[PDB]
């Protein structure tokens, strides 16, 4: 586990393709992590995985979508 830690997020996203509509800063403050393939993204807590990602996009929004119950995203790390 060991990704509670912000920056521990940030280091799973070595080659997060460069031309992304959201970045891997955000994805991380969002709770998630790079799978290595593509855009697709896992939260380190629920085990949620989202991909596609477009311009205007909340990574909190669809992080809740996909995952309303999420420990991580209802404040269970603050
Ligand atoms: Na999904
Ligand atoms: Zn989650």
Same mark, same amino acid.
Do not use: M
């Given at each position: /586990? /060991?990704? *509670? /830690?912000?920056? &521990?997020?940030?280091?799973? #996203? ?7 509509? *959201? ?10 992590? @790079?799978? =290595? ?12 995985? *989202?991909?596609?990602?477009? @311009? =205007? ?8 979508? /996909? ?6 995203? &209802?404040? #269970? @790390?603050?």
């Amino acid at each position: /586990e /060991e990704f *509670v /830690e912000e920056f &521990n997020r940030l280091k799973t #996203f070595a080659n997060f393709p460069s031309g992304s509509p *959201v970045s891997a800063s955000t994805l991380a403050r969002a709770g998630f992590l @790079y799978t =290595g393939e593509g855009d697709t993204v896992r939260c380190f807590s629920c085990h949620a995985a *989202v991909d596609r990602w477009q @311009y =205007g996009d909340s990574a909190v929004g669809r992080h809740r979508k /996909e995952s309303p119950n999420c420990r991580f995203i &209802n404040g #269970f @790390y603050l």
